Write a protein that binds this ligand. Structure first.
Ligand SMILES: CCCCCCCCCCCCCCCCCC(=O)OC[C@H](COP(=O)([O-])OCC(O)COP(=O)([O-])OC[C@@H](COC(=O)CCCCCCCCCCCCCCCCC)OC(=O)CCCCCCCCCCCCCCCCC)OC(=O)CCCCCCCCCCCCCCCCC
Ligand SMILES: CCCCCCCCCCCCCCCCCC(=O)OC[C@H](COP(=O)([O-])OCC(O)COP(=O)([O-])OC[C@@H](COC(=O)CCCCCCCCCCCCCCCCC)OC(=O)CCCCCCCCCCCCCCCCC)OC(=O)CCCCCCCCCCCCCCCCC
Ligand SMILES: CCCCCCCCCCCCCCCCCC(=O)OC[C@H](COP(=O)([O-])OCC(O)COP(=O)([O-])OC[C@@H](COC(=O)CCCCCCCCCCCCCCCCC)OC(=O)CCCCCCCCCCCCCCCCC)OC(=O)CCCCCCCCCCCCCCCCC
Ligand SMILES: CCCCCCCCCCCCCCCCCC(=O)OC[C@H](COP(=O)([O-])OCC[N+](C)(C)C)OC(=O)CCCCCCCCCCCCCCCCC
Ligand SMILES: CCCCCCCCCCCCCCCCCC(=O)OC[C@H](COP(=O)([O-])OCC[N+](C)(C)C)OC(=O)CCCCCCCCCCCCCCCCC
Ligand SMILES: CCCCCCCCCCCCCCCCCC(=O)OC[C@H](COP(=O)(O)OCCN)OC(=O)CCCCCCCCCCCCCCCCC
Ligand SMILES: CCCCCCCCCCCCCCCCCC(=O)OC[C@H](COP(=O)(O)OCCN)OC(=O)CCCCCCCCCCCCCCCCC
Ligand SMILES: CCCCCCCCCCCCCCCCCC(=O)OC[C@H](COP(=O)(O)OCCN)OC(=O)CCCCCCCCCCCCCCCCC
Ligand SMILES: Nc1nc2c(ncn2[C@@H]2O[C@H](COP(=O)(O)OP(=O)(O)OP(=O)(O)O)[C@@H](O)[C@H]2O)c(=O)[nH]1
Ligand SMILES: [Mg+2]
Lengths: 120, 320, 347, 99, 49, 459
């Protein structure tokens, strides 16, 4: 779908047109879940390595957390930019092809005859 | 920096440590044959490391604080019980036989570790290669079930294959009556119950399986009790051996690296001593397994990992 | 092997795969497959036993036959278009030849027989490499030529892969063969949505590689290759078996775990194309994989099998080496379902 | 021996060491406090205060409002001769039938 | 001490501890500064401010 | 819903960070506190639903179910801590964690505004439930029970997943409100017939429908007591709640698609009530009685009347409470004689008088004695069925007769007659067990004073 999109330069995680969108907030629920994933990784690291799972290596658990949040922020930016691109192309295509997307003639339920099915 | 690929890559080679006296010597013989004296003076005068014979608590000695643990948590077998009721229904005969073979595997790994890491030779009292003598002796006396020697053969075949045999196999030759008189001399009441048939079976296994089969991959040095007291003569014959048999001559740094990798990893050394072959003498039920494991975990310094046990005096858990 | 030589051979395997994924020219793609196979054969024979030698020989035979068929497909395509660029194939029989060659390289069902035997015959590290890294190059080629594949051929092979992976894995007590049959089923799941959405293929591949890495690293940590040997692991390191159970539940696609994401996304994308019978068949068939995963979980963590007396020795010892990124692989393979909309980053 | 297994242990009677056992814990103090927190938070709070909270919940379903509306409508319809309820729920002027 | 053999993890790896703390602080600082400049870039591209 | 969900999530850190001997105290105290908070969801509106956010909403159907779940958690904790007294601290914390995870999943399942989110949350309940059954069950039969429960549920659920994503692709939304307001009549075609079957069969096997029920005796019998409590009390109700939600897109196809299911449940309530008359396992008898009440719920949902839906809601609530009470009562005797055989321990009223009183109350509620809410639900469903067809009164009257017979038969065989001579270990009832029965029975009877709280949104 999006592979051969025009202007799509290779090996570029965020293109420069993404800087027009709002960056994700720092307390973004998805970013906080990223940090939680890092914290779980640190706890499981203590468990497998046979260390006290909660209080051993606070620097290591902390680094797990911050690296997970660091990757999550950029992942969120790229995801949001891809969805913005999707909506951008969809609206452009609906605009360029009005015949494929007609203006449906709206009618009220007072003139629309819906069939009644009794429950009995 | 534990010896790994990165250490071996830069400059860690073992041939540059190997020398003429960088040999592993195993002293052997029946019970009360006096291997202790021969081995200890051999090590002291040839400048090697002595390893006292691998007991029930050898593993307890090489881990933790080096003190023996309760028989319930380590061993779960007795030698006095074997000397009192060798044909008991507990399976204690083969449970003991497997535990001390595993201890011998651990000790052979530990001795090869010292040799390949420092270059110094070692001397051992018995080894994995002469552990089967007692198994066959017990079998002829009808202690172990035939099922229980097939399992022993399986474990020995899949574990001992990975290691290099001793350079020198020194054997002390004592007749059965003299061994019997020495057992009656030292006064151990459990040793006092050892029948002459058991000792004769042990000597026969030595003479007809052990000594001949070492003769094709190592140099075997036999002394009776008279020539075993002259350690000077024994080490003189040790120094006169060519040692051009076996796999030791055709060893290069590539194979020594793999051997050091296996030998330093104790969990890989003992891997196959716990194969899922369910024999009543050594199978542990799930309830007993779980309970005994929890009681082991409750030991001081045994719960988390060395250096992470605050209850034993370990600091900086939160920065490690 | 020499550590430098083993590192070089690993790097050559990855560089063959990268050559496959970065080339626009069919000859260079074929070169990448050749280089990957050449460097891969020695890592299979690292331990060198007759099982390892036979595994390497069967692997070589299948991969070389597939490579020759791929070259023939390239030559037929050039014969009719004069084109070397990897793009839609201009000839239908060349396309069929290429599809069969790529499926044989992947190990899809009609060409699946090599996967269980080779996985059993090699070590767990070799199997980890075999079932994770070796899927990248053929799948990337397939994603590049997806617009010209015959959907009937591809969907047939994918459905057969799911069925055979489910059935074959039902009979296994060997962990490596169980992994191989699970891999066959997951390859079928990947290749079913390939005609419709290659992004779904990439997503499923990433999730499967995460789970397979976690499971193989847990097996290496356990030193277990049979179901009974794994049944002793609770009495040594119960954390490993509980983590393995949650990973197996993820492999079964049970919500709310990460393994449910690829199935759910693929079913959605297929129903978007008026494909309803095939997704229902696929989801129903995956219950076999879940059945033998649950059998493994029963024997490993949810119940306690008899231990041995010699296990008390292992209690006093730690691991000499530690599996890299295993905690991350475990968390990623189980806990990432709330992050699903991030899949659009793969667009 | 068929395997090394512990014999099945006998069940412990909480009353034997603690005649005053409430059945929560082998330690008498935590057993007592378990009983206390269970009874307080269950009966004193969730049951009594919860039942009172549900009993005095503000108008549920707006039934009183519906009754007052119905009373006003009944008064207006009866005082003016209008039917108390029409069969047509919706006015037939905002309905356009097809034919 | 208590153990016969010296535990590999008997004392903190001070170089590794310092590296871990430093790389985490840098990651946080870099993330905060990137978000600040990203909000700024969004506001000026979109004419918000 | 976050003021309910987040405290429940906070049970896990609190459980894992508490002392080894404060585990049960802390979990019980704070789960009761969460149940107190869940009561505020019973303030409902006549017409609209409580639409908190885009992702969670509450109405008169789901609020009593949420209260039932939050109430069941502490009773679970009191029931478990006896048989898990010899367990390790970590394993007790894992059991509590499983129970908390189950409660959290159930809470989000009953409030999910979207159908696919409901699907994932309702499928997530399998994992802690399966773990509980297979890890902490007592017999070798727990493994086969776990397999049956898992694969029955999944064979039901996967076609539902396919149908849900198809509906989202064709309609554009799986949002409950949008689904209701944009409802299209379902035409008569094979496509729509199989869409109906896919939308219905998962909830059918969950309830369970007679003929698809063979997992339930295994699972409810082999599970530990807390597992049986949840399986009978809240997990069966997932099928009824989901069926009530999803039947709004299945009309008028439900008019004739329900005939095989109506026949199956109307006859299978008779069949399973008769099975109870001959069950030699007490826990199995209690498990088999759930099938009949759930068959009544199936009929009520399938005939699609306001009275039928009111009765089905009330019956689900009442059955949850009563079945959990009965399982606890059987478990108290099991913990004394270490057996589920019913004629093993007879004449228990002359040894445990107040426990015999608890047994009589539980039997009376299972009898649907008026004015209990069991009777209210059953009677409403019976009246709606009588309107549906008068001949339904034969089968439903037969069922209530047989239900009376087996309930009172269980009471008589366990409590009455002469005590067993060689059973000399029937210790006096602990305060904990009596409190468990009291906390089962008191809210059941209090609901009779305010029956509209459990009559659903059609009240
Ligand atoms: C990797 C590091 C391997 C290593 O230690 O090499 C040392 C290297 C070779 O040592 P050796 O003694 O000759 O060989 C030992 C064996 O490797 C056996 O040593 P081991 O038992 O420690 O091995 C564990 C095993 C298991 O692996 C590990 O423990 C680490 C590797 C897996 C996890 C990290 C990679 C994947 C990350 C992304 C995952 C998705 C997101 O490692 C491997 O199988 C390594 C294979 C070669 C490296 C490439 C592996 C790629 C796997 C993933 C493919 C798909 C990626 C996404 C696309 O020595 C050096 O000095 C270098
Ligand atoms: C976007 C980019 C995000 C990442 C930015 C950079 C983060 C720091 C890079 C260094 C690093 O984390 O290396 C991990 C790297 C991973 O190997 P490992 O076996 O997982 O190490 C765990 C040991 O406990 C390691 O224990 P240790 O005592 O040997 O060393 C403590 C360790 C601290 O190690 C850690 O914290 C382990 C790594 C945690 C994060 C790993 C993944 C990071 C990326 C996110 C992955 C998840 C994405 C989720 C979302 C996916 C899409 C939905 O810190 C260091 O060794 C120094 C780090 C600075 C150089 O380990 C080392 O470098 C040390 C060995
Ligand atoms: C105008 C129209 C009508 C409007 C009102 C309608 C009211 C209901 C009418 C229909 C009733 C038909 C059935 C009558 C009972 C037949 C069985 C019988 O006699 O059992 C006696 C027996 C207790 O006496 P027992 O056998 O001498 O005790 C022996 C003990 O071992 C040793 O005992 P002890 O000597 O140590 O003395 C202690 C004894 C003290 O109590 C007694 O001695 C018996 C008290 C009987 C109260 C009146 C009958 C029950 C009425 C409500 C049910 O208490 C206990 O043993 C513990 C009981 C704890 C729970 C009690 C029940 C809930 C709270 C009270 C509700 C009133 O069990 C009960 O009283 C439970 C009856 C449960 C009936 C099934 C549920 C049907 C639906 C009820 C809806 C109620 C809604 C409104 C109230 C809500 C309250 C939360
Ligand atoms: C859990 C839920 C989410 C699942 C998926 C999580 C993915 C995490 C990692 C995402 C990394 C970035 C994904 C895209 C990527 O690899 O490259 C983007 C790419 C990098 O180059 P790329 O596009 O060649 O990389 C992806 C490969 N294809 C072509 C198949 C998409 O970004 C671009 O802008 C390049 C476009 C032109 C390419 C020529
Ligand atoms: C009886 C004798 C007379 C009493 C006093 C007269 C008033 C009266 O009866 O009022 C009764 C009232 C309603 O009758 P009322 O309408 O007469 O109340 C009078 C008060 N005003 C006028 C303000 C309405 O109902 C109750 O008090 C009963 C409460 C039932 C619900 C209790 C919930 C407790 C939850 C604990 C956890 C367990 C949950 C289990 C699952 C539940 C799912 C929903
Ligand atoms: C299902 C849950 C789904 C959501 C969470 C996902 C999983 C997260 C944890 C993954 C597993 C990690 C631990 C593995 C394990 O089983 O550990 C066993 C261990 C038992 O006790 P033990 O080993 O003696 O403890 C040593 C000292 N902790 O266990 C423990 O000691 C503790 C086990 C639970 C982990 C700790 C939870 C509470 C920690 C404090 C609150 C943390 C909140 C986050 C923010 C932290 C900020 C510092
Ligand atoms: C594996 C073993 C066999 C499993 C069962 C067999 C499944 C496949 C058999 C055919 C099912 C019926 C079918 O294909 O329905 C198609 C129907 C219409 O959709 P469509 O094809 O797009 O046509 C639209 C109009 N042109 O689709 C729809 O209306 C949407 C239906 C989506 C879900 C379908 C699930 C299968 C059908 C229901 C099975 C019964 C319920 C589950 C029972 C346990 C299984
Ligand atoms: C162990 C089994 C566990 C459970 C398995 C799953 C549940 C059972 C099977 C469910 C699927 C049933 C599908 C039925 C589709 C019916 C489609 C149809 O045509 O319906 C319309 C039809 C109208 O008939 P008509 O005479 O036109 O009505 C008057 C106006 N002319 O009206 C009808 O056709 C009404 C339905 C007639 C057929 C069924 C009647 C019930 C008979 C008992 C079924 C019990 C289930 C097992 C059967 C095994 C054989
Ligand atoms: N069952 C059994 N006992 C063994 C085994 N290896 C050593 N022992 C016992 O270990 C004990 C220690 O004495 P030994 O090492 O045999 O002899 P010793 O008294 O030191 O005398 P020397 O052999 O002359 O040094 C004896 O009771 C042996 O029977 C074995 O593999 N099996
Ligand atoms: Mg000795």
């Amino acid at each position: 779908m999006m592979s051969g999109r025009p202007g799509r330069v290779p090996l570029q995680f965020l293109p420069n047109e993404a800087r027009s969108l709002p960056p994700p907030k720092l307390t973004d629920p998805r970013l906080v879940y990223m940090g939680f994933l890092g914290y779980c990784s640190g706890l499981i690291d203590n468990a497998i390595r046979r260390r006290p799972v909660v209080s051993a290596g606070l620097h290591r658990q902390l680094l797990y957390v911050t690296s997970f949040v660091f990757f999550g922020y950029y992942l969120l930016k790229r995801q949001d930019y891809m969805y913005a691109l999707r909506d951008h192309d969809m609206f452009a295509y609906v605009k360029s092809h009005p015949e494929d997307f007609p203006e449906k003639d709206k009618k009220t339920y007072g003139e629309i005859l819906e069939e009644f099915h009794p429950v009995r | 920096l534990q010896y790994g690929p990165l250490a071996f890559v830069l400059g860690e080679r073992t041939t540059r440590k190997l020398t003429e006296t960088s040999k592993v010597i195993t002293v052997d013989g029946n019970i009360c044959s006096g291997k202790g004296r021969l081995a200890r003076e051999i090590a002291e005068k040839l400048g090697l490391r002595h390893f006292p014979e691998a007991g029930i608590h050898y593993a307890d000695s090489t881990t933790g604080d080096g003190k023996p643990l309760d028989v319930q948590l380590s061993g779960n077998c007795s030698l006095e019980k074997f000397y009192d009721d060798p044909k008991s229904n507990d399976g204690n005969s083969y449970r003991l036989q497997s535990w001390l073979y595993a201890s011998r595997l651990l000790q052979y790994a530990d001795a090869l570790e010292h040799l390949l890491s420092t270059g110094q030779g070692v001397v051992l009292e018995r080894s994995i290669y002469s552990d089967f003598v007692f198994l066959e002796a017990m079998y002829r006396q009808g202690f172990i079930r035939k099922q229980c020697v097939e399992h022993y053969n399986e474990v020995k075949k899949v574990t001992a294959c990975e290691y290099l045999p001793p350079h020198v196999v020194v054997y002390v030759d004592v007749p059965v009556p003299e061994i019997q008189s020495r057992i009656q001399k030292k006064g151990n009441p459990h040793e006092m119950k050892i029948t002459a048939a058991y000792l004769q079976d042990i000597e026969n296994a030595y003479k007809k399986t052990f000594l001949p089969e070492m003769s094709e991959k190592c140099e075997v040095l036999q002394y009776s009790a008279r020539e075993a007291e002259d350690a000077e003569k024994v080490v003189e014959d040790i120094e006169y051996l060519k040692c051009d048999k076996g796999p030791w001559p055709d060893q290069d740094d590539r194979t020594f690296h793999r051997l050091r990798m296996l030998v330093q990893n104790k969990l890989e050394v003992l891997n196959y001593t716990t194969i899922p072959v369910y024999l009543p003498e050594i199978t542990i039920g799930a309830h007993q397994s779980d309970r005994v494991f929890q009681k082991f975990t409750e030991l001081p310094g045994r719960k988390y990992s060395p250096g992470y046990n605050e209850d034993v005096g370990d600091k900086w858990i939160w920065l490690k | 092997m020499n550590p430098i030589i083993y590192t070089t051979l690993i790097m050559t395997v990855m560089s063959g795969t990268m050559l496959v994924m970065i080339s626009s020219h069919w000859l260079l793609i074929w070169i990448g497959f050749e280089m990957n196979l050449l460097a891969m054969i020695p890592v299979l024979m690292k331990n060198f036993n007759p099982r390892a030698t036979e595994a390497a020989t069967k692997y070589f035979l299948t991969q070389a036959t597939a490579s020759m068929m791929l070259m023939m497909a390239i030559i037929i395509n050039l014969l009719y278009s004069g084109q070397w660029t990897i793009t839609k194939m201009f000839n239908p029989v060349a396309m069929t030849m290429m599809t069969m060659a790529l499926a044989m390289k992947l190990g899809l069902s009609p060409f699946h027989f090599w996967v269980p035997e080779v996985t059993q015959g090699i070590s767990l590290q070799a199997g980890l490499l075999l079932l994770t890294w070796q899927k990248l190059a053929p799948l990337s080629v397939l994603c590049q030529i997806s617009q010209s594949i015959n959907p009937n051929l591809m969907l047939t092979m994918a459905m057969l892969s799911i069925l055979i992976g489910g059935w074959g894995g039902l009979n296994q007590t060997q962990l490596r063969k169980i992994m191989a049959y699970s891999s066959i089923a997951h390859m079928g799941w990947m290749t079913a949505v390939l005609p419709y959405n290659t992004t779904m293929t990439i997503l499923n591949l990433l999730i499967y590689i995460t789970m397979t890495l976690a499971m193989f690293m847990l097996l290496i940590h356990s030193s277990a290759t049979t179901t009974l040997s794994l049944s002793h692991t609770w009495n040594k390191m119960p954390v490993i078996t509980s983590l393995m159970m949650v990973t197996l539940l993820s492999m079964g696609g049970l919500p709310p775990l990460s393994g449910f994401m690829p199935k759910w996304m693929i079913i959605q994308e297929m129903t978007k194309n008026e494909s309803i019978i095939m997704p229902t068949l696929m989801a129903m068939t995956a219950l076999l994989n879940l059945y033998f995963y649950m059998r493994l979980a029963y024997s490993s963590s949810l119940t306690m099998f008899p231990s041995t007396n010699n296990m008390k020795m292992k209690w006093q010892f730690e691991h000499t080496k530690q599996m890299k990124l295993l905690p991350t692989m475990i968390v990623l393979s189980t806990l990432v379902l709330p992050m699903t909309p991030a899949l659009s980053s793969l667009n | 021996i068929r395997l090394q297994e512990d014999p099945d242990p006998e069940d412990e009677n909480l009353y034997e060491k603690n005649p005053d056992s409430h059945g929560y814990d082998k330690d008498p103090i935590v057993d007592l406090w378990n009983m206390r927190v269970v009874f307080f938070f269950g009966f004193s709070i969730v049951l009594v205060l919860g039942s009172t909270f549900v009993a005095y919940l503000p108008d549920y379903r707006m039934q009183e409002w519906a009754r007052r509306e119905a009373e006003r409508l009944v008064k207006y319809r009866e005082a003016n001769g209008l039917p108390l309820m029409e069969s047509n729920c919706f006015d037939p002027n905002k309905i356009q039938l097809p034919e | 001490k208590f153990y016969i053999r010296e535990p590999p993890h008997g004392s903190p790896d001070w170089l590794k501890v310092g590296l871990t703390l430093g790389t985490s602080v840098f990651l946080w600082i870099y993330l905060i500064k990137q978000h600040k400049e990203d909000v700024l870039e969004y506001k000026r591209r979109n004419g918000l401010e | 819903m976050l003021k309910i969900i987040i405290p429940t999530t906070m049970l896990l850190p609190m459980t894992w960070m508490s002392k080894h001997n404060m585990i049960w105290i802390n979990a019980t105290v704070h789960s009761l506190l969460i149940s107190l908070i869940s009561l505020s969801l019973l303030n409902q509106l006549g017409e609209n639903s409580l639409n908190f956010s885009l992702t969670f909403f509450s109405d008169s159907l789901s609020a009593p179910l949420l209260v039932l779940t939050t109430w069941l958690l502490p009773l679970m904790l009191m029931a478990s801590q006896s048989h898990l007294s010899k367990e390790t601290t970590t394993r007790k914390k894992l059991y509590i964690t499983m129970l908390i995870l189950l409660q959290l999943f159930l809470i989000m399942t009953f409030t999910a505004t979207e159908l696919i989110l409901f699907y994932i949350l309702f499928e997530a309940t399998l994992v802690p439930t399966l773990i509980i059954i297979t890890r902490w069950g007592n017999q070798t039969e727990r493994l086969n029970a776990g397999l049956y429960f898992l694969f029955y549920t999944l064979a039901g659920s996967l076609p539902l997943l396919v149908a849900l994503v198809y509906i989202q692709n064709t309609t554009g939304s799986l949002n409950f409100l949008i689904i209701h307001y944009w409802s299209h009549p379902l035409s008569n075609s094979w496509s729509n017939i199989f869409m109906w079957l896919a939308c219905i069969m998962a909830f059918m096997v969950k309830m369970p429908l007679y003929g698809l029920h063979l997992w339930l005796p295994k699972a409810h019998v082999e599970a530990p007591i807390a597992g049986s409590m949840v399986l009978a009390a809240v997990l069966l109700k997932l099928g009824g709640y989901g069926m009530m939600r999803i039947t709004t897109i299945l009309n008028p196809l439900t008019n004739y698609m329900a005939y095989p299911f109506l026949m199956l449940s109307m006859w299978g309530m008779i069949m399973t009530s008769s099975i109870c008359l001959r069950q030699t396992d007490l826990k199995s008898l209690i498990a088999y009685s759930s099938v009949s009440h759930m068959a009544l719920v199936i009929v009520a949902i399938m005939i699609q009347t306001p009275w039928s839906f009111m009765g089905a809601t009330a019956l689900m609530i009442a059955h949850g409470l009563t079945s959990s009470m009965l399982f606890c009562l059987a478990n108290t005797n099991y913990e004394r004689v270490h057996s589920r055989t019913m004629i093993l321990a007879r004449g228990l009223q002359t040894l445990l008088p107040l426990m015999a009183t608890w047994w009589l109350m539980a039997s009376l509620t299972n009898l649907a004695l008026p004015p209990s809410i069991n009777l209210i639900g059953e009677l409403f469903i019976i009246t709606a069925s009588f309107s549906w067809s008068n001949i339904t009164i034969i089968l439903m009257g037969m069922n209530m007769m047989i239900t009376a017979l087996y309930s009172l038969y269980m009471l008589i065989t366990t409590q009455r007659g002469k005590y067993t001579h060689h059973i000399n270990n029937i210790k006096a009832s602990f305060t904990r067990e009596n409190a468990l029965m009291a906390l089962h029975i008191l809210p059941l009877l209090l609901l009779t004073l305010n029956p509209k709280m459990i009559l659903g949104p059609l009240y």
